[PDB]
Write a protein that binds this ligand. Structure first.
Ligand SMILES: COC1=C(OC)C(=O)C(C/C=C(\C)CC/C=C(\C)CC/C=C(\C)CC/C=C(/C)CC/C=C(\C)CC/C=C(\C)CC/C=C(\C)CC/C=C(/C)CCC=C(C)C)=C(C)C1=O
Ligand SMILES: CCCCCCCCCCCCCCCCCC(=O)OC[C@H](COP(=O)([O-])OCC[N+](C)(C)C)OC(=O)CCCCCCCCCCCCCCCCC
Ligand SMILES: CCCCCCCCCCCCCCCCCC(=O)OC[C@H](COP(=O)([O-])OCC[N+](C)(C)C)OC(=O)CCCCCCCCCCCCCCCCC
Ligand SMILES: CCCCCCCCCCCCCCCCCC(=O)OC[C@H](COP(=O)(O)OCCN)OC(=O)CCCCCCCCCCCCCCCCC
Ligand SMILES: CCCCCCCCCCCCCCCCCC(=O)OC[C@H](COP(=O)(O)OCCN)OC(=O)CCCCCCCCCCCCCCCCC
Ligand SMILES: NC(=O)C1=CN([C@@H]2O[C@H](COP(=O)(O)OP(=O)(O)OC[C@H]3O[C@@H](n4cnc5c(N)ncnc54)[C@H](OP(=O)(O)O)[C@@H]3O)[C@@H](O)[C@H]2O)C=CC1
Ligand SMILES: COC1=C(OC)C(=O)C(CC=C(C)C)=C(C)C1=O
Ligand code: SF4
Ligand code: SF4
Ligand SMILES: [Zn+2]
Lengths: 314, 386, 83, 174, 198, 43, 157, 340
């Protein structure tokens, strides 16, 4: 069985990953007074499969470059992103890990390399400049991203994502800790290099510059799967879907609904906002958010103690 | 050379032909030396070998975002040399389509500025309005852009029977469309940052580098050639120049959104007060005879044959006539021998001066800043390269 | 072949362009179409020829159908007029 | 008459108002509302093959040579269409046809050279060369774009019905 | 008939004398065209001095340079006719100062007087070949990097002498002497009958 | 023969001014609802 | 059926459908015909609807639309970018200024056509070729690709 | 039947050579169409490759100079119409691999004999047939032996038909030079007899092309069997190392019996997609270059051969690593010339 449970939890996500690009190229469209892709297939449903086939068939030109730090980079990007769905706790998870959120934080952190490796591998100036800035904001955002989670955990009692289903049986962790949700949402927007915070690989063509066909696709796939995963982590950590032990799927049904809406939100954010400047972006995290996060981090070590609410381990 | 890189000509940023060599210490720009001529095509030499009426189509191509306003400048220039002036209805038309064209340019400049910045929805919102305007061009000239409607002696053909009404419905609504863009960019917590205090140009420096456009107006210098030196019937209308303070990318922008607003005020009037009359001078000497007349009257055929085959035969002289094209002062210095074909026609391009300023504007600025400043100069490489 | 008769001989190179392709020629060859046009009989010595439709025709010319010996032919329409 | 586009106390009410604007991103939320609003508007796009963007009678489109209703081609080779073409596109050489009339042996519009100004439409005395409505004549090979008299006359015969309607609508204006 | 306002013709004429007196040196043939336009003509040496007086004089402030151009009259010994068109924002007026320069007799540069000229002077060198001393950086602005010849000179062929195509053998773009497939038809247009000057 | 001209009496009036609406919840009120949410959540 | 020839054709078709449904263009945007393409990308005539993406870098671009005069200085670049695209690549010349030389054919700085610097597959005519016309031209590229039969020639070779 | 040559000599000029060239898509071909197009000749290029692949040839030809016709070797009718209006026919039809439904004899002998028969019927003034150098009916490699059979036959279908016989060709996109350079992937570079006793004389592709073109426009060549050879011979050892030298990749010439190696060629030959090495190739590679005894080619036909070292830098540059691409040939050491 366990193998079947690996197809499910993977394919299903890959098929959904494909349908996100479509729901991105249509929701951005109607917002901009245009139908979007509807001519290939019925209502554009076959559109994601079509360019996938075009991308893989086109020549994967190897520049006159490394040949490994070039092919390792997309493999790593897809591998980490699809891997991080392993411990996610939809209803009950596939591989329940006692230190689950540290797994998600660590696996995300590893993706910054793929950007670094691809930028060095390309051996062209646009790629290296883009990679250095890209690596900078990714790890810069990781620092507030991690502290925001540590505040959460201390009110959850453990690192296991499964505990939050029992923590959020009466109220979402948005009500409490909303100030961080916002700061988790903005950090989720930075770490998926989505719009407001998408300076790398902008209209300025960073680490796709030299990447075409199959390599382009793999990161590509990775980004979008991440786009979902991070949104899904928002939908478990802060928006806690109702859980009934008798019927486990209403948890997944609402997880489905909240994840799609917050996934819709970063699509909506992209069309709505101009992109921030490179330093504007770091100015936000180190000046605007990190002092807010570190202080609210202390408030979340104090809220438990003097409100005699220290969370139950386990 | 501070890892000097050359901004891409194909780059989506830029208007397609800007090889901006930039030596950058990391992400800071030390010096910008724009390269030009990637679109030089010979427009100034070609005109010497063509007659006045067959050189009119070149002007539409000089800066084609602003298709017509450019023609008006050659028109005016050729009319001055002949000491002929267009009929009253034609004048209003030229101001009607002169302004419609200003909107078209500003929708281009504001929305294309945002696309480089990264905001993409304003472009699609206003390109639909643009589209609707093009249709005016087409139903008046025949071409969506590159019309050739404003000729040296007035307009070519009267407005179709019904256009004015539609240039109303549109105008009646376009405002809301500008308003929307606003709710998306004027106060965006982020548009301001990337635009505010970027490329500030002093008032004295703007006059010195010959900026002559919104770029001057944005710095607070009050100069609109349309109010200072009225051309056509822009004197009979009433509009407010949108002067700016704390000149910077954001302020000038606000100015371009404000002239979009003021042009709707000028368009309204033109629709309200356009006179009954003829749309071309009655001198068969300068304007081609009506086709019913050339097919029934000998003097009209002779005048049709000579005008199309040989030309106006402008009296010898030279003139520099400048209008207020949407980008800035567009002027034609047209030296002319008594011949039917011009001798020289230097096109002053608001843009040759503006690009030059890129160096004195983008100093100690990041790569992204350079992208913002090329946008705030509305550089159309056709006018610069000519 | 065509209105003018442009044709390529066997030895003629420059005829390959049609190999496996088609040439543009005209049925309704005009050379014969006005010849197919009846002679417009008239009463007056001289007659006009707007080409038909005024502004949508040719610059109006007056033809002298004065000699039955010759049917005036407006240089624009090739229409013969029979006095 | 001029206007100041951007020419410009601290009260808790004011400040608290301003601080909330920075802290909870109030104006950013305003922008999202605008795009959500259009998402609900009807899209303006047209099915391109099925529905076509409207072009009125003066649209210049693709060159055609007309013929008289009788069947005699209108052009009489005065060759001023060649004289006024800005791009040097039209090449005309003529000789008296056996009929004795004046006709063009070769009329070649190089469409790649042509910039579709529409002056030829203007210049012709018999109005033999017209700007036809069709804009869809994209061709696989460069040679196809060069057009001789037979293609243009054939183009004229195919679109004569609409060309006649278009000239009918706009001739009073000219 | 254009709506001439004699009020102007006079005021600009009066300024033309004013300038002629203020700079008797370097200024000749000052005339106000029938188009209400003034066109002081200066000896080439007066480039720096005449401009500076106009840029910085209370009674004649001509702050921005609208354009710098060079007509080429091949007949004229001094081939080029550098023309500088200047605008007074304060007085709402415009003036033209035109000098003469031969091919190998350079003119001074006014980048000092107006920095607008930094680019136009490079444009005049590239197209006509006049040279401007003391220019910060003269270099082709419009022509190709390897272009030989100054294009807007009346003695330069329109089509030029070189054109570019991609050659497979050498896998690189390559100039070749121009071979045109339909030469520019040079219609003669001047009519042998003049028009009795009004 | 007819010439396209403004309708008799002139056309109606157009808007040439921004009609952007300054509509928002007052700041204090905004903060209070938020702080109240956290207080309830903490309890 | 199983006789390979049939099997091959079907496979080829699939391959053609994928490339023909999703063509990602890149717009050098020389000159003005670029404005008439931005109109295609715009709402009346949505390019995306057909699967054409509004923008793409050269590495990820299937078709290059050369809009505008290809001047002698820009001629070396055009080539570079054409040479920097994938193995299945195509060029749609747009504008009389790039089909041939256009109003600027006899100039000294304008290449008389881009098909002298890059092989061109569809030539879209018109000084500002109408946006609908470009769309017609992009659609004819789609019929050109549909007819291509790469694997059947492999099989029969 | 002729076309007076008018013009200055470049594109958009006329030379009067209408020429069918059946295998133009080839490495040699590409070059043949280049000069023919440069000169202004009318070139009809028969093709059976897809239109996308034939695009590269379009640009070097001027407007209307190049005409492409759909043609199938098995179908006699296709060859018939191609030569209908040509006066010069050039045959470059060969493939070193034996494909499943085109065997070596068919491509080298059957297809040319039919093509030559067609132009005798058409009345083409001259036919140029290309066969590999040192080709004898009892030679080692079938390809060569067959090609030898071929040159004979076509003589009977088309008498006085020129037969240029080029050596293995040196040029960008060639095999002779790239093949060896691509041995990099292989850690060791096998060389029969350790790359000795198979002296080889390369010839630049262009030289060959120019030569071929000059044939088309010269009465001196009729029934001539020219041999474009080269400017210097080489023992395969220096060639291999030299290549690796410019490529800046190590060299380990390893002796391996041709016996066993013919087997390696068989292995690649087995591969479905364009086998990289061929049993017939292998033999050819170690087939010693024959001393020029046939009709002189280059120089004789008007082009002075071009030394290998001169242009090698361009052919082997892509084979080179990230660094050493700016390495240039004159700082590099040119290998010694062994005439033997
Ligand atoms: C320059 O390169 C480009 C980009 O970078 C800026 C883009 O992101 C974009 C814009 C992005 C898009 C949403 C359109 C392209 C979308 C895709 C490549 C989707 C790819 C689809 C897939 C691989 C689906 C995966 C399917 C499976 C493996 C399922 C298996 C079970 C484009 C078009 C582009 O050209
Ligand atoms: C499982 C295998 C793990 C091997 C770890 C090796 C650690 C020591 C470094 C080895 C690589 C450096 C070296 O000496 O070889 C040079 C070579 C250089 O390869 P290259 O070809 O990529 O680098 C040069 C590229 N050119 C020359 C084209 C510019 O290293 C490799 O071949 C790739 C090494 C991959 C190491 C294993 C990665 C596994 C996944 C990691 C996440
Ligand atoms: C439906 C989905 C939401 C649509 C929002 C856009 C449409 C409505 C637009 C309203 C408008 O234009 O005015 C906005 C107005 C515009 O503001 P303004 O700039 O006009 O002025 C108001 C603010 N003052 C007056 C103080 C300056 O903004 C607001 O009303 C306040 C918005 C607060 C947003 C706080 C962050 C978002 C919420 C984070 C916490 C989690 C919430 C739940 C998350 C999901 C849970 C499942
Ligand atoms: C590509 C590289 C990155 C791949 C994605 C990131 C993988 C991150 C793995 C984190 C370590 C695993 C972990 O944290 O939990 C494993 C779990 C033990 O934890 P727990 O379940 O709490 O045990 C006690 C209570 N059950 O149960 C186990 O201990 C299972 C055994 C350990 C499995 C660890 C992950 C194995 C990955 C194998 C492929 C690695 C590929 C590396 C490639 C780079 C070169 C080495
Ligand atoms: C007893 C009580 C104890 C607790 C006390 C709590 C007190 C009240 C809470 C205080 C903190 C509230 C706000 C916290 C988050 C915001 C922090 C912040 O200041 O934002 C940074 C930035 C500021 O904007 P800027 O103008 O650049 O900076 C000015 C100052 N330099 O803002 C930005 O730039 C934002 C850019 C955003 C770009 C994307 C926008 C997306 C908007 C839609 C999504 C909104 C979030 C949705 C979340 C859904 C659920 C997760
Ligand atoms: N390069 C070399 O190794 C040398 C070659 N030669 C001779 O010169 C000639 C050209 O050489 P080269 O260009 O390298 O050869 P290529 O391998 O490039 O092939 C030459 C042409 O032959 C065509 N062709 C091959 N098989 C068939 C077939 N069954 N039916 C129709 N056409 C076919 C190919 O077309 P397509 O691929 O489109 O089917 C190709 O365009 C060869 O015939 C060879 O004998 C002489 C010395 C050295
Ligand atoms: C007018 O100048 C141009 C641009 O900047 C303004 C573009 O971004 C682009 C790119 C736009 C599209 C349609 C991808 C083009 C085509 C261009 O020429
Ligand atoms: S003008 Fe009209 S009639 Fe005279 S030649 Fe040109 S086309 Fe024929
Ligand atoms: S073709 Fe017409 S539109 Fe396209 S570039 Fe040349 S001129 Fe501008
Ligand atoms: Zn008649």
């Amino acid at each position: 069985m366990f193998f079947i449970n690996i197809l499910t939890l993977l394919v299903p996500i890959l098929i959904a990953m494909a349908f996100l690009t479509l729901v991105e190229r249509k929701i951005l469209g109607y917002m901009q007074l245009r139908k979007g892709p509807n001519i290939v297939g019925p209502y554009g449903i076959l559109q994601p499969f079509a360019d996938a086939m075009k991308l893989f068939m086109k020549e994967p030109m190897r520049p006159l470059t490394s040949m490994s730090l070039f092919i390792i980079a997309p493999t790593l990007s897809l591998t980490l992103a699809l891997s991080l769905w392993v411990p996610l706790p939809m209803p009950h998870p596939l591989i329940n890990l006692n230190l689950g959120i540290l797994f998600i934080l660590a696996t995300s952190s590893l993706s910054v390399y793929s950007i670094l490796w691809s930028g060095w591998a390309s051996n062209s100036k646009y790629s290296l400049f883009g990679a250095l800035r890209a690596v900078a904001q990714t790890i810069s955002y990781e620092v507030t991203m991690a502290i925001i989670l540590l505040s959460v955990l201390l009110m959850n009692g453990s690192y296991s994502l499964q505990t939050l289903i029992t923590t959020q049986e009466h109220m979402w962790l948005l009500l409490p800790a909303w100030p961080m949700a916002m700061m988790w949402f903005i950090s989720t927007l930075a770490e998926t290099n989505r719009a407001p915070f998408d300076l790398t690989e902008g209209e300025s063509e960073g680490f796709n510059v030299e990447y075409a066909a199959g390599p382009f696709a793999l990161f590509f796939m990775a980004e979008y799967t991440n786009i979902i995963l991070m949104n899904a982590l928002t939908t478990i950590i802060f928006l806690g879907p109702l859980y009934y032990i008798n019927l486990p799927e209403l948890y997944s049904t609402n997880f489905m609904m909240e994840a799609l809406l917050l996934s819709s939100t970063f699509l909506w954010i992209r069309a709505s906002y101009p992109r921030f400047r490179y330093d504007q972006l770091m100015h936000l995290l180190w000046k605007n958010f990190l002092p807010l996060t570190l202080a609210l981090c202390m408030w979340h070590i104090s809220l438990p103690i003097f409100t005699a609410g220290v969370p139950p381990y386990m | 050379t501070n890892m000097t890189l050359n901004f891409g000509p194909q780059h989506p940023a830029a208007h397609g032909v800007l090889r901006l060599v930039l030596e950058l210490s990391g992400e800071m720009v030390r010096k910008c030396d724009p390269h030009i001529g990637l679109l030089h095509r010979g427009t100034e030499k070609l005109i010497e070998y063509k007659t006045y009426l067959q050189a009119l189509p070149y002007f539409d191509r000089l800066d084609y975002v602003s298709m017509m306003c450019n023609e008006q400048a050659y028109s005016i220039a050729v009319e001055k040399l002949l000491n002929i002036q267009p009929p009253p209805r034609a004048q209003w038309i030229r101001v009607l389509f002169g302004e419609i064209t200003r909107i078209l340019n500003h929708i281009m400049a504001v929305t294309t500025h945002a696309l480089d910045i990264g905001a993409m929805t304003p472009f699609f919102w206003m390109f639909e309005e643009r589209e609707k305007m093009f249709e005016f061009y087409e139903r008046v000239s025949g071409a969506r852009m590159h019309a050739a409607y404003i000729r040296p002696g007035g307009v070519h053909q009267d407005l179709p029977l019904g256009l004015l009404d539609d240039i109303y419905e549109f105008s009646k609504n376009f405002s809301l469309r500008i308003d929307e863009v606003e709710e998306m960019l004027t106060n965006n917590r982020i548009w301001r940052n990337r635009t505010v205090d970027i490329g500030v140009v002093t008032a004295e420096d703007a006059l010195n580098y010959g900026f002559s456009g919104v770029m001057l107006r944005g710095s607070g210098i009050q100069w609109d050639l349309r109010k200072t030196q009225p051309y056509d019937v822009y004197d009979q209308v009433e509009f407010d120049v949108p002067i700016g303070s704390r000149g910077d990318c954001y302020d000038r922008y606000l100015c371009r959104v404000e002239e979009m607003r003021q042009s709707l005020r000028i368009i309204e009037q033109c629709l309200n007060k356009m006179p009954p009359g003829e749309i071309k001078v009655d001198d068969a000497k300068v304007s081609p005879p009506k086709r019913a007349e050339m097919k029934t009257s000998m003097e009209s055929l002779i005048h049709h044959f000579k005008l199309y085959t040989e030309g106006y035969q402008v009296p010898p002289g030279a003139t520099y006539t400048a209008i207020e094209a949407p980008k800035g002062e567009f002027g034609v210095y047209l030296v002319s021998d008594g011949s039917s074909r011009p001798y020289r026609c230097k096109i002053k391009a608001p843009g040759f001066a503006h690009l030059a300023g890129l160096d004195k504007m983008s100093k100690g600025h990041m790569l992204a800043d350079v992208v913002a400043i090329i946008g705030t100069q509305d550089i159309v490489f056709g006018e610069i390269d000519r | 072949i065509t209105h003018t008769g442009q044709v390529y001989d066997e030895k003629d190179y420059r005829r390959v362009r049609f190999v496996d392709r088609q040439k543009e020629v005209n049925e309704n060859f005009a050379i014969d179409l006005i010849a197919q046009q009846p002679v417009n009989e008239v009463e007056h010595r001289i007659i006009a020829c707007d080409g038909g439709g005024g502004a949508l025709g040719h610059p109006k010319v007056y033809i002298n159908l004065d000699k039955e010996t010759k049917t005036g032919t407006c240089g624009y329409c090739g229409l013969q007029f029979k006095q | 008459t001029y206007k100041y586009v951007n020419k410009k106390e601290v009260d808790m009410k004011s400040a608290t108002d301003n601080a909330a604007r920075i802290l909870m991103w109030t104006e950013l939320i305003r922008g999202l509302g605008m795009t959500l609003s259009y998402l609900f508007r009807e899209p303006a796009t047209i099915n391109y093959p099925f529905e076509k963007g409207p072009l009125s009678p003066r649209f210049r489109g693709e060159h055609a040579l007309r013929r008289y209703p009788s069947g005699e081609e209108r052009c009489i080779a005065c060759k001023l269409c060649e004289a006024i073409c800005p791009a040097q596109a039209i090449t005309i050489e003529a000789e008296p046809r056996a009929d004795g009339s004046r006709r063009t042996t070769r009329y070649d519009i190089d469409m790649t050279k042509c910039i579709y100004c529409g002056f030829c439409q203007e210049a012709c005395p018999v109005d033999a060369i017209v700007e036809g409505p069709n804009f869809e004549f994209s061709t696989e090979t460069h040679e196809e774009l060069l057009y001789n008299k037979e293609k243009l006359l054939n183009n004229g015969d195919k679109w004569e019905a609409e060309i006649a309607a278009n000239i009918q609508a706009d001739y009073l204006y000219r | 008939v254009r709506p001439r306002s004699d009020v102007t013709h006079k005021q600009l004429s009066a300024f033309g004398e004013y300038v002629a007196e203020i700079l008797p040196k370097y200024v000749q043939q000052v005339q106000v065209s029938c188009l209400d336009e003034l066109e002081i003509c200066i000896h080439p040496d007066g480039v720096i001095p005449t401009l500076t007086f106009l840029r910085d004089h209370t009674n004649a402030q001509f702050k921005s340079l609208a354009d710098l151009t060079a007509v080429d009259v091949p007949t004229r010994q001094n081939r080029f006719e550098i023309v500088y068109n200047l605008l007074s924002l304060r007085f709402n007026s415009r003036i033209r100062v035109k000098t003469y320069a031969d091919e190998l007799t350079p003119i001074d540069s006014i980048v000092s007087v107006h920095i607008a000229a930094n680019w136009y002077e490079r444009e005049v060198w590239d197209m006509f070949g006049v040279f401007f001393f003391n220019h910060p950086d003269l270099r082709r602005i419009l022509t190709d990097y390897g272009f030989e010849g100054h294009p807007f000179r009346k003695d330069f062929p329109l089509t030029g002498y070189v054109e570019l195509r991609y050659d497979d053998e050498v896998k690189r773009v390559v100039a070749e002497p121009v071979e045109l497939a339909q030469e520019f038809r040079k219609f003669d247009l001047n009519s042998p009958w003049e028009a009795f000057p009004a | 023969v007819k010439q396209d001209m403004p309708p008799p009496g002139g056309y109606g009036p157009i808007d040439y001014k921004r009609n952007l609406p300054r509509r928002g919840l007052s700041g204090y009120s905004m903060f209070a609802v938020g702080i109240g949410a956290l207080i309830f959540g903490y309890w | 059926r199983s006789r390979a020839e049939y099997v091959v054709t079907k496979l080829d078709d699939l391959i053609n459908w994928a490339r023909r449904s999703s063509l990602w263009p890149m717009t050098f945007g020389l000159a003005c015909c670029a404005v008439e393409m931005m109109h295609m990308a715009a709402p009346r005539y949505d390019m995306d609807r057909f699967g054409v993406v509004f923008r793409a870098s050269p590495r990820q671009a299937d078709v290059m639309i050369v809009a505008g005069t290809l001047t002698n200085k820009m001629a070396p670049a055009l080539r570079k970018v054409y040479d920097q695209m994938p193995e299945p690549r195509y060029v749609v010349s747009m504008g009389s200024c790039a089909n041939g030389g256009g109003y600027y054919h006899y100039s000294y700085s304008v290449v008389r056509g881009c098909d002298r610097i890059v092989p061109v597959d569809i030539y879209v005519p018109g000084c500002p070729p109408t946006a609908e016309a470009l769309l017609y031209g992009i659609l004819q590229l789609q019929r050109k690709i549909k007819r291509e039969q790469k694997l059947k020639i492999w099989y029969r070779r | 039947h002729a076309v007076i040559p008018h013009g200055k000599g470049g594109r958009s000029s006329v030379s009067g050579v209408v020429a069918t060239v059946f295998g133009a898509t080839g490495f040699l071909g590409r070059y043949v169409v280049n000069h023919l197009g440069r000169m202004g000749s009318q070139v009809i290029i028969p093709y059976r490759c897809d239109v996308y692949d034939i695009m590269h040839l379009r640009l070097m030809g001027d407007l209307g100079q190049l005409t492409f016709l759909e043609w199938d070797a098995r179908d006699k009718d296709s060859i018939r119409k191609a030569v209908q209006h040509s006066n010069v026919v050039i045959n470059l039809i060969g493939r070193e691999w034996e494909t499943r439904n085109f065997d070596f004899e068919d491509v080298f002998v059957n297809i040319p004999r039919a093509i030559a028969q067609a132009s005798k019927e058409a009345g083409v003034e001259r036919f140029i047939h290309v066969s590999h150098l040192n080709a004898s009916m009892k030679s080692s490699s079938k390809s060569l032996r067959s090609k030898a059979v071929g040159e004979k036959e076509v003589r009977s279908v088309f008498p006085e038909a020129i037969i240029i016989r080029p050596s293995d060709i040196f040029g960008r996109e060639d095999r002779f030079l790239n093949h060896f350079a691509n041995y990099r992937w292989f850690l060791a570079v096998p060389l029969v007899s350790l790359g000795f006793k198979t002296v080889k004389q390369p010839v630049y592709v262009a030289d060959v092309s120019k030569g071929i073109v000059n044939a088309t426009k010269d009465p001196d060549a009729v029934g001539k069997t020219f041999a474009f050879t080269g400017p210097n011979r080489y023992l395969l050892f220096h060639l291999v190392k030299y290549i690796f030298g410019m490529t800046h990749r190590t060299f380990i010439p390893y002796p391996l019996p041709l016996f066993v190696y013919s087997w390696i060629g068989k292995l690649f030959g087995l591969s479905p997609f364009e086998p990289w090495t061929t049993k017939d190739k292998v033999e050819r590679i170690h087939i010693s270059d024959v001393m020029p005894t046939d009709l002189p080619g280059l120089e004789d036909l008007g082009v002075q051969p071009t030394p290998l070292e001169l242009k090698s830098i361009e052919v082997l540059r892509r084979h080179r690593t990230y660094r050493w691409l700016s390495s240039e040939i004159e700082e590099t050491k040119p290998a010694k010339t062994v005439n033997y």
